[PDB]
Design an enzyme around this catalytic site. Structure first.
Site, short mmCIF file in Angstrom:
data_model
loop_
_atom_site.label_atom_id
_atom_site.label_comp_id
_atom_site.label_asym_id
_atom_site.label_seq_id
_atom_site.Cartn_x
_atom_site.Cartn_y
_atom_site.Cartn_z
N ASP A 75 0.84 -1.20 0.00
CA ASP A 75 0.00 0.00 0.00
C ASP A 75 0.88 1.26 0.00
O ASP A 75 1.24 1.78 1.06
CB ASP A 75 -0.93 -0.06 1.21
N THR A 76 1.21 1.77 -1.19
CA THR A 76 2.11 2.92 -1.25
C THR A 76 1.47 4.18 -0.67
O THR A 76 2.21 5.12 -0.34
CB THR A 76 2.58 3.18 -2.69
N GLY A 77 0.15 4.22 -0.53
CA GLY A 77 -0.53 5.34 0.10
C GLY A 77 -0.64 5.25 1.61
O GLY A 77 -1.27 6.11 2.23
C1 LIG Z 1 -8.62 -0.89 2.14
C2 LIG Z 1 -7.15 -0.56 1.76
C3 LIG Z 1 -6.76 0.92 2.04
C4 LIG Z 1 -7.01 1.38 3.50
C5 LIG Z 1 -6.16 0.53 4.49
C6 LIG Z 1 -7.59 1.86 1.06
N1 LIG Z 1 -7.12 3.25 1.15
C7 LIG Z 1 -5.88 3.62 0.39
C8 LIG Z 1 -4.70 3.77 1.39
O1 LIG Z 1 -3.50 3.87 0.70
C9 LIG Z 1 -4.90 5.00 2.25
C10 LIG Z 1 -4.80 6.28 1.46
C11 LIG Z 1 -4.87 7.48 2.44
C12 LIG Z 1 -3.61 8.31 2.76
C13 LIG Z 1 -3.69 9.50 3.74
C14 LIG Z 1 -5.03 9.86 4.40
C15 LIG Z 1 -6.30 9.03 4.08
C16 LIG Z 1 -6.22 7.85 3.09
N2 LIG Z 1 -3.81 5.00 3.22
C17 LIG Z 1 -4.05 4.74 4.66
O2 LIG Z 1 -5.14 4.55 5.09
O3 LIG Z 1 -2.86 4.74 5.45
C18 LIG Z 1 -2.97 4.80 6.95
C19 LIG Z 1 -2.09 4.01 7.42
O4 LIG Z 1 -0.69 4.84 7.18
C20 LIG Z 1 -0.97 6.09 7.38
O5 LIG Z 1 -0.52 7.00 6.18
C21 LIG Z 1 -1.61 7.34 5.51
C22 LIG Z 1 -2.84 7.19 6.56
C23 LIG Z 1 -2.51 6.21 7.42
S1 LIG Z 1 -8.36 4.42 1.17
O6 LIG Z 1 -7.84 5.76 1.24
O7 LIG Z 1 -9.19 4.29 2.35
C24 LIG Z 1 -9.28 4.14 -0.38
C25 LIG Z 1 -10.44 3.12 -0.44
C26 LIG Z 1 -11.15 2.92 -1.76
C27 LIG Z 1 -10.70 3.71 -3.01
N3 LIG Z 1 -11.37 3.53 -4.27
C28 LIG Z 1 -9.55 4.70 -2.93
C29 LIG Z 1 -8.83 4.91 -1.60
#
Ligand SMILES: CCC(CC)CN(C[C@@H](O)[C@H](Cc1ccccc1)NC(=O)O[C@H]1CO[C@H]2OCC[C@H]21)S(=O)(=O)c1ccc(N)cc1
Lengths: 99, 99
Positions: free
Chosen positions: B25-27
């Site tokens: 999960d690069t995000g």
């Molecule tokens: C179900 C799998 C993941 C959540 C686990 C899905 N996410 C993308 C994810 O990369 C998200 C993208 C994201 C980045 C920043 C703020 C909100 C969401 N990152 C995230 O939640 O990371 C958390 C854990 O590390 C920390 O750094 C970022 C937040 C913390 S999401 O944002 O909720 C998402 C769900 C469905 C779609 N179509 C597009 C995005």
């Protein structure tokens, strides 16, 4: 190019004649962008992640340019804390994970 | 390996002597795993996603093997929708984005 992950993989995109910054996000099924007043029809959708769900507007066949790479596909618009390019468009620009 | 993004980039990880499936999960800045028992001291923390903030237990200096590559770093445990490997560990296994 090659992007390392020491910092967030932010890039400039072009959508609906606007430039924005967005994350290249392999964990996002679909692209989700900050609230923006896009023309045309849409369908309601709810997308979930850490913390729960947000409501978004699903636009289809939207043209996006990511680092000069053109793509066209689904773009979700809503109160997202961050703009993310998801796999639906990352595939179209040839993006892979490599280690 | 090189991983395309037509499907979720799911890989097998080994942590605390157990095998699990996790999303690259690069995000995600951080690595968050679903509820599980982990040996080691933990500290309660808050982490925020697309839908708000959840309560997690922070384990530090945890050994974790991702797709055959070893990492030792911080692992958050809590009610995440799916196991995600975030950038804090992706950097350790030499993972880059390429297009
Ligand atoms: C179900 C799998 C993941 C959540 C686990 C899905 N996410 C993308 C994810 O990369 C998200 C993208 C994201 C980045 C920043 C703020 C909100 C969401 N990152 C995230 O939640 O990371 C958390 C854990 O590390 C920390 O750094 C970022 C937040 C913390 S999401 O944002 O909720 C998402 C769900 C469905 C779609 N179509 C597009 C995005």
């Amino acid at each position: 190019p090659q992007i390392t992950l020491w910092k967030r993989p932010l890039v400039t995109i072009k959508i609906g004649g606007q430039l924005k910054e967005a994350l290249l996000d392999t964990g996002a099924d679909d692209t989700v962008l900050e609230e923006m007043n896009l023309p045309g029809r849409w369908k309601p959708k709810m997308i979930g992640g850490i913390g729960g769900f947000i409501k978004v507007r699903q636009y289809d066949q939207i043209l996006i340019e990511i680092c000069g790479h053109k793509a066209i596909g689904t773009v979700l618009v809503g109160p997202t804390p961050v703009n993310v390019i998801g796999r639906n468009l990352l595939t179209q620009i040839g993006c892979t994970l490599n280690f």
